[PDB]
Design a protein around this ligand. Structure first.
Ligand code: CL
Length: 260
């Protein structure tokens, strides 16, 4: 019956909706188009950040290393990096900027540090994720062209990976905690999955948007007095200039958590 309501939601929205919920209470899943590929857009910032955190388990001072920010590094959306031009930022700072403000320079700096999009992809493979692929840098990774496999993953794979990163042992204790802390500090997702959940639940999420009105949110959710959930909501639309539909994500979140 949940599937019915997601299909009716997708029908009303006019686009293509991919949902994957893992309920860690009973290891159950709600899947909707969960094996289809969707452009990740900024939700891929989580994988780049984790790649850097993983590197730091072997290089402890890594997060304190400084990277220069120049005008040549600016792209389309640099809310934090633009304040630091001609200075340096630590990788920890860049990680926080990418995850909490969706800063695209920060993402490009993380990508560069671990050796480019193919290295981020190789990191995901090491975690058991054979679906994720990051192909391009910012800003082109957000084109979200229908049919284009570049910079895509599936809801099911991102839910399982995010589970590994945030609730599992893919990262060391210090590093997993850092990742969850950054995500719980996100500033950009109050209108997406969070908007479909009770005020009392705690969310750490990473949003994403791009071409074809693509609107995404990935989240680890701590309900009150319940085991955590992982929720992936991906949404994309037929028109290239379509507007973002964060409300669709909020409705999906409401639909699949009704009864928890
Ligand atoms: Cl409420």
């Amino acid at each position: 019956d949940v599937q019915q309501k997601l299909a009716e939601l997708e029908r009303q929205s006019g686009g293509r909706l991919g949902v994957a919920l893992i309920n860690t209470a009973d290891n159950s899943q709600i899947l909707y188009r969960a094996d289809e590929r969707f452009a990740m857009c900024s939700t891929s910032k989580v994988m780049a950040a984790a790649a850097v955190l993983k590197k730091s388990e072997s290089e402890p001072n890594l997060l304190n290393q400084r990277v220069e920010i120049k005008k040549s590094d600016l792209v389309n959306y640099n809310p934090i990096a633009e304040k630091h031009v001609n200075g340096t930022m630590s990788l920890a700072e860049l990680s926080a900027a990418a995850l909490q403000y969706s800063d695209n320079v920060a993402m490009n700096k993380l990508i560069a540090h671990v050796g480019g999009p193919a290295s981020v992809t190789a990191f995901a493979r090491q975690l058991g994720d054979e679906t994720f692929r990051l192909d391009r840098t910012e800003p082109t990774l957000n084109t979200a062209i229908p049919g284009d496999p570049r910079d895509t993953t599936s809801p099911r794979a991102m839910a399982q990976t995010l589970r590994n990163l945030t609730l599992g042992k893919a990262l060391g204790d210090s590093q997993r905690a850092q990742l969850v802390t950054w995500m719980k500090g996100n500033t950009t997702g109050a209108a997406s999955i969070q908007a479909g959940l009770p005020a009392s639940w705690v969310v750490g999420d990473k949003t994403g948007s791009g071409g074809y009105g693509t609107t995404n949110d990935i989240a680890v959710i701590w309900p009150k007095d319940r085991a955590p959930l992982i929720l992936v909501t991906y949404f994309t639309q037929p028109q290239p200039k379509a507007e973002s539909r964060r409300d669709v994500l909020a409705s999906a979140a409401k639909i699949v958590t009704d009864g928890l």
